[PDB]
Enzyme design. Structure first.
Site, PDB file in Angstrom:
ATOM      1  N   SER A  40      36.879  41.184  46.309  1.00 13.32           N
ATOM      2  CA  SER A  40      38.236  41.641  46.009  1.00 13.32           C
ATOM      3  C   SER A  40      38.556  41.585  44.526  1.00 13.32           C
ATOM      4  O   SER A  40      39.663  41.237  44.133  1.00 13.32           O
ATOM      5  CB  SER A  40      39.266  40.879  46.850  1.00 13.32           C
TER       6      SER A  40
ATOM      7  N   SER B 196      44.884  44.436  49.001  1.00 18.17           N
ATOM      8  CA  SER B 196      43.492  44.797  48.742  1.00 18.17           C
ATOM      9  C   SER B 196      42.808  45.511  49.898  1.00 18.17           C
ATOM     10  O   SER B 196      41.690  46.013  49.714  1.00 18.17           O
ATOM     11  CB  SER B 196      42.661  43.571  48.342  1.00 18.17           C
TER      12      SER B 196
ATOM     13  N   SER C 168      45.731  40.211  50.163  1.00 16.71           N
ATOM     14  CA  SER C 168      46.738  39.190  49.884  1.00 16.71           C
ATOM     15  C   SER C 168      47.728  39.694  48.858  1.00 16.71           C
ATOM     16  O   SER C 168      47.362  40.469  47.965  1.00 16.71           O
ATOM     17  CB  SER C 168      46.059  37.920  49.370  1.00 16.71           C
TER      18      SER C 168
ATOM     19  N   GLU D 133      46.189  47.942  40.104  1.00 14.29           N
ATOM     20  CA  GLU D 133      46.193  46.491  40.144  1.00 14.29           C
ATOM     21  C   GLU D 133      46.740  45.936  38.837  1.00 14.29           C
ATOM     22  O   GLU D 133      46.403  46.477  37.762  1.00 14.29           O
ATOM     23  CB  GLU D 133      44.774  45.954  40.324  1.00 14.29           C
TER      24      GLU D 133
END
Ligand code: CB4
Length: 263
Positions: free
Chosen positions: A105, A45, A212, A141
């Site tokens: 995020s 991210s 992460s 994503e």
């Protein structure tokens, strides 16, 4: 040459069992401290800063772009959507998407930024336009966080990301109003108190974006205003050999503390 600071970072890395990458720029004198500074790491991210900045650049020629609504549909939700799930069957503006992506995020928010730029390559194209020849975004994503060792997709180097973050937040990659907006967003991050900033006095002002992913990948990029001196830019990337490894924000804090000690 290996400096005392670099020796301490290597010691930290040895104890950690992972692979650590660090890049500091001290803007008082433009000096740099690097540890594995030219090795590639999965961004996870932390890549959202480049995407948000790219949309800020688009907004320089469209005064109303940040207020433009973007539809959020049920099918758009991915693995982590703390803000976008509130707006399903509704809309979010590009400012709201930027803020959600950066400060929480939100991964659906990031996908909307990527789509506004024409796909992952639009994010890479912006990086190139501001002098970053290293950054690459290849996927959306959530798959951009797979963080597989040896995979070049969705990677950069500590050196490149520190230089870019400096140009975006303290330099002139963006217009003045847009630079200020990006700094405001980063300074309002909710996810960062256990990472770089945990290694610095809590009294120093900073903004950051964490990352992460798989392989216990644990990242942070920060702009820091220490008491009494010019700002710093600091990148800390960390990744581990096992796919299901646990997060290690403490390693980032320890890296930042070593850098701080070194000033
Ligand atoms: B970014 O790197 O912050 C997006 N992160 C993710 O998508 C992952 N986890 O995010 C949450 C769920 C908020 C967390 O627990 O860190 C993620 C993707 S693959 C993986 N193992 N973790």
């Amino acid at each position: 040459q290996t400096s005392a600071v670099q020796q301490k970072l290597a010691a930290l890395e040895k104890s950690s069992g992972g692979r650590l990458g660090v890049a500091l720029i001290d803007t008082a004198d433009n000096t740099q401290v690097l540890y594995r500074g030219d090795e590639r790491f999965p961004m996870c991210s932390t890549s959202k800063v480049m995407a948000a900045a790219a949309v800020l650049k688009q907004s320089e020629t469209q005064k109303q772009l940040l207020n433009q609504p973007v539809e959020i549909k049920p099918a758009d939700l991915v693995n982590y959507n703390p803000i976008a799930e509130k707006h399903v069957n509704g809309t979010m503006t590009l400012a709201e998407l930027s803020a959600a992506a950066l400060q929480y995020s939100d991964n659906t928010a990031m996908n909307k930024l990527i789509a506004q730029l024409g796909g992952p390559g639009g994010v890479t194209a912006f990086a190139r336009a501001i002098g970053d020849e290293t950054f690459r975004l290849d996927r959306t994503e959530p798959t951009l966080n797979t963080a597989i060792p040896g995979d070049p997709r969705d990677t950069t180097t500590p050196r490149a990301m520190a230089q870019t973050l400096r140009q975006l937040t303290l330099g002139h990659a963006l217009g003045e109003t847009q630079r200020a907006q990006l700094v405001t967003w980063l300074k309002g991050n909710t996810t960062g108190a256990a990472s770089i900033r945990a290694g610095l006095p809590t009294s120093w002002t900073a903004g950051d974006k964490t990352g992460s992913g798989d392989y216990g990948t644990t990242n942070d990029i920060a702009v820091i205003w220490p008491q009494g001196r010019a700002p710093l830019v600091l990148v800390t990337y960390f990744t581990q050999p096992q796919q299901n490894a646990e997060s290690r924000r403490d390693v980032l804090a320890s890296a930042a503390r070593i850098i701080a000690e070194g000033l």
